[PDB]
Write a protein that binds this DNA or RNA. Structure first.
Ligand SMILES: Cc1cn([C@H]2C[C@H](O)[C@@H](COP(=O)(O)OP(=O)(O)OP(=O)(O)O)O2)c(=O)[nH]c1=O
Ligand SMILES: [Ca+2]
Ligand SMILES: [Ca+2]
Ligand SMILES: [Ca+2]
Ligand SMILES: [Ca+2]
Ligand SMILES: [Ca+2]
Length: 900
DNA sequence: CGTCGCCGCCGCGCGG
DNA sequence: CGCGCGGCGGCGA
């Protein structure tokens, strides 16, 4: 096979590399790598190395990496550019793997672990590590086994061995309901003392050294606790055995609030799953406990136990160990679904970076670009110092707040990357500048043509048309990958809707799910078989369809994020190719493109309908437009349609056959105007929205910029079995809004758009009556706990203290002097509740860590003093009044003459 | 060390 | 609750 690296590190003058050899075996080597850097030379000397501007360079080969680094410093002291890859391990990887990397995931050791630490005196601080580690479950991807290390004797209690038999039994049998599919995969090892446990762990770690190290909060907890506990018991050199090269560093993350010291293990790539999940999942959650994320992702119940966790080992060691094992598997199950590890490996190997660098698009793009340029013997520029400067972004149209019955949206495919490709925006393609007219002049096509030679953006920039820049070239490759995966995703989604439809008539039989590839549209043959299947098989197929969809979503949306990050990186000072001329060229062009097509769509539809000056485009944001279709529907007449799907077909056909061709012509004209290198402004129909035929639903409404709701029947070619609410910006979409409130506000909107004013009034009235029965968690707001110490004055709110910080301070006073109460962690999420006047907490609100029940100490008092009225007024009624007034509806029935 | 736009809540200090 | 301004949180692109 083709060799591929596992991990790479620079230690002084040595590259330490772990890799898979041609035989598929893990090896390690130390290389005294001689790096090269470059300096400009006279045009009058022979060379094959040139910078991106075509200036000739001479290669400087160094005896070792430290010499190379010192040369950089001397070049700074002289005042001359030191060119080339100054991250010597990226140069090493480029030299060693001078080909597209084919990796075999089965050869890569992915370790998933978690630890248990019994602690009576509060949260066990990793940097102190003063309490015994009493359980480690370490899953190994290569062995496919859960290795369980269990402490039997501790200063906090001596316990019996864990029973695998009881762990397999149902909870109703007194068991732990450890899923049957992993029972045979548990290798259980009890220990009489913590020393032997840790020594055996390290020996085990030596035999099965993780390449990818993951788990839940392992970077902030498990890793530093294990390292520090071992350091406390045995000394540093023994702790350093967690690194295959025996080197570690104790380092902080730079922020703007506080600091936390994490452990860098040289020769391992740590990908904490919480960090994988936060970057790649495209959610914001009220809580990031594994219980919460597991319930959300997998619909599994919370791990249930009595008393505090600090007493669990003592009271019920059986369950303690089982819940440790189950916690590991749940991360595996989340990954099986989301596929973030797979995504990380893909991106990592593509860029030829340390895998853990996927968290950093700047590092990723820096390495992609460097490899692309090196292939052509081109030399990258030195990174420079730049002051942070604000620059303009997208255009957003101000909508007229109103109901909107029929709506068709259109959206530009991958806007910013396509602008980069169309215009040819790249560091080395800058051709010069032209004299800019006000942007509206370009929008209305009244400004003089920018250039007859070069490709232009209305910010004044000009670019070469003779050849593609490295940015367009490299961004196009990832874009194409993205497109493929989006194709798989949408097809899985369409297939899902076919299964949903079929589920309306399940056939009563014993049968199996069809063996199909969900990434491809179901054939007619498959459709007919599905029409003959039982609910059991259809539901299992739907589950499989939805899993394929999720897999496709992960692959596509994060490649989208990566290509969009290239456009953003051009506006970040740490990017090697930082250039505000290029970042602004993208965004200004975007503002022109949007407003230009607004004009064209308006001009086109006015002609179709025989009017003048009327606005059809009601809204737009960045690259999408929302077109009112009322008049199109009205021109045929609502009476003429058989059912909802019929007018949906009609709008789909009208958008695909009349509007899209007009949109294309309008954009082809803009391309010529700007003299761009390649027409790539592709604006397709996205949504078809409206109320059900014959109903009193309003279809959609806008309250303002980035705030609207639509009743969608068709989204980029996916015809839904049941209409789906597209809601943006409104309170239903915010992680800060109470759960039950999100739910009720969503149902109010559903009723408004699908059913009408009377249905909405019927629901509101019922919610208002029953609201006081809602569980306190379901009605708590959520916020992030930032800068607590800034607003802490003696335990009481300082000047300008935010509401939620006030709540935290109230909580702190209430729990003061209590070792075992959950402390609020700076930066993490809190639930927030209003408190009625004259409560014992001595303030108007209280906040506690999210995802958890509030400590039993103050729960009863919180539940008794919760201010439901404030809750109902602030989180529900005020948002609802905002919706309804915008939609010109009343949520409460107004009095009429009929009341006699 | 991808970006900007822009919403609503809140504290504050008004606003004769 | 009448109002904007700045801080904040949190999405929407
Ligand atoms: C989502 C997102 C968009 N944008 C900008 C760049 C996008 O091109 C532009 C439009 O956003 P989107 O329409 O959400 O995304 P897109 O056009 O790039 O991709 P798609 O084909 O799925 O429509 O807004 C960002 O800068 N960062 C982001 O995270
Ligand atoms: Ca635990
Ligand atoms: Ca788009
Ligand atoms: Ca599209
Ligand atoms: Ca059937
Ligand atoms: Ca869009």
């Amino acid at each position: 096979m083709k060799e591929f690296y596992l991990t790479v590190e620079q230690i002084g003058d040595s590259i330490f590399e772990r890799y898979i050899d041609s035989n598929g075996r893990e090896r390690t080597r130390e290389v005294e790598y001689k790096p090269s850097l470059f300096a400009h030379c006279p045009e009058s000397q022979a060379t094959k190395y040139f910078d991106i501007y075509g200036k000739p360079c001479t290669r400087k080969l160094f005896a070792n990496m430290r010499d190379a680094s010192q040369w950089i410093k001397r070049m700074e002291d002289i005042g001359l550019e030191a060119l080339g890859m100054d991250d010597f391990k990226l140069a090493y990887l480029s030299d060693t793997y001078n080909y597209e990397i084919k990796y075999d995931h089965t050869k890569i050791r992915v370790a998933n672990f978690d630890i248990e630490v019994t602690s009576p005196d509060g949260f066990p601080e990793p940097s102190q590590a003063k309490h015994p580690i009493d359980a480690i479950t370490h899953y190994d991807s290569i062995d496919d086994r859960f290795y369980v290390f269990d402490l039997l004797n501790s200063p906090y209690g001596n316990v019996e061995e864990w029973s695998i038999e009881i762990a397999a039994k149902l909870q109703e049998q007194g068991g732990d309901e450890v899923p049957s599919e992993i029972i045979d995969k548990i290798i259980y090892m009890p220990f009489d003392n913590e020393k032997e446990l840790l020594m055996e762990y390290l020996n085990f770690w030596q035999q099965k050294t993780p390449v990818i190290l993951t788990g839940w909060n392992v970077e902030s907890f498990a890793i530093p606790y294990v390292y520090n506990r071992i350091k406390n018991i045995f000394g540093e050199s023994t702790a350093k055995r967690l690194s295959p090269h025996r080197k570690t560093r104790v380092k902080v993350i730079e922020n703007m609030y506080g600091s936390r010291e994490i452990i860098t293990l040289f020769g391992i790539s740590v990908l904490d799953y919480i960090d994988l999940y936060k970057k790649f999942s495209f959610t914001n959650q009220p809580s990031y406990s594994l219980d919460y994320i597991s319930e959300f992702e997998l619909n599994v119940g919370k791990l249930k136990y009595d008393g505090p966790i600090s007493k669990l080992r003592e009271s019920n060691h059986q369950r303690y160990i089982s819940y440790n094992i189950i916690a590991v598997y749940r991360v595996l199950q989340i990954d099986a679904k989301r596929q973030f590890i797979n995504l990380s490996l893909d991106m990592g190997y593509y860029a030829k970076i340390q895998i853990q660098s996927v968290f950093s698009p700047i590092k990723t793009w820096d390495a992609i670009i460097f490899n692309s340029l090196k292939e052509q013997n081109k030399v990258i520029p030195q990174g420079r110092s730049h002051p942070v400067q604000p620059y303009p972004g997208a255009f957003v149209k101000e909508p007229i707040p109103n109901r909107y019955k029929y709506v068709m949206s259109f959206d530009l495919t991958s806007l910013y990357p396509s602008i980069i490709r169309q215009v040819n925006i790249s560091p080395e393609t800058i051709a010069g500048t032209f004299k800019v007219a006000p942007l509206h002049d370009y929008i209305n096509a009244v400004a003089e043509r920018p250039s007859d030679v070069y490709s232009c953006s209305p910010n004044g920039m000009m670019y070469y048309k003779d050849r593609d820049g490295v940015v367009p070239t490299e961004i196009t490759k990832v874009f194409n990958q993205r497109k493929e995966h989006k194709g798989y995703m949408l097809a899985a989604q369409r297939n899902g809707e076919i299964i949903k439809e079929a589920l309306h008539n399940p056939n009563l039989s014993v049968d199996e799910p069809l063996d199909v590839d969900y990434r491809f549209d179901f054939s007619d043959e498959i459709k007919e078989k599905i029409k003959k299947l039982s609910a059991k098989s259809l539901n299992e197929m739907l589950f499989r369809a939805q899993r394929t969809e999720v897999a496709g979503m992960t692959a596509q949306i994060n490649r989208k994020l990566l290509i969009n990050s290239l456009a953003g990186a051009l506006g970040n000072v740490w990017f090697r190719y930082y250039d505000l001329r290029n970042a602004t060229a993208i965004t200004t062009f975007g503002q022109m493109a949007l407003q230009w097509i607004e004009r064209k769509v308006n001009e086109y539809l006015n002609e179709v309908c025989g009017t003048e000056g009327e606005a059809f485009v009601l809204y737009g944001d960045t690259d999408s437009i929302y077109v009112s279709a009322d008049k199109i529907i009205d021109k045929v007449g609502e009476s003429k349609f058989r059912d909802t799907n019929h007018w949906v077909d009609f709008l789909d056909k009208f958008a695909r056959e009349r509007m899209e061709p007009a949109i294309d012509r309008g954009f082809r004209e803009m391309c010529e105007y700007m003299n761009n290198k390649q027409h790539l402004m592709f604006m397709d129909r996205e949504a078809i929205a409206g109320p059900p035929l014959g109903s009193k639903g309003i279809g959609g409404f806008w309250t303002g910029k980035k705030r609207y709701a639509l009743n969608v029947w068709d989204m980029e070619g996916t015809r839904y079995a049941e209409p789906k609410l597209k809601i943006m910006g409104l309170e239903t979409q915010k992680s800060s809004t109470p759960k039950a409130v999100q739910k009720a506000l969503k149902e109010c909107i559903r009723r408004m758009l699908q059913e009408g004013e009377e249905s909405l009034q019927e629901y509101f009235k019922e919610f208002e009556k029953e609201f006081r029965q809602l569980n306190y968690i379901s009605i708590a707001s959520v916020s992030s706990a930032n800068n607590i110490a800034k607003y802490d004055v003696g335990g009481f709110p300082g000047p300008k203290c935010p509401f939620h910080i006030r709540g935290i301070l109230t909580y702190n006073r209430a729990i003061k002097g209590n070792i075992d109460a959950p402390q609020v962690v700076e930066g993490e999420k809190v639930y927030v509740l209003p408190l009625r006047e004259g409560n014992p907490f001595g303030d108007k609100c209280i906040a506690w860590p999210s995802g958890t029940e509030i400590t039993d100490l103050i729960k009863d008092d919180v539940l008794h003093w919760m201010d439901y009225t404030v809750l109902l007024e602030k989180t529900f009624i005020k948002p609802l009044e905002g919706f309804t007034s915008a939609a010109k509806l009343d949520y409460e029935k107004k009095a009429s003459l009929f009341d006699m």
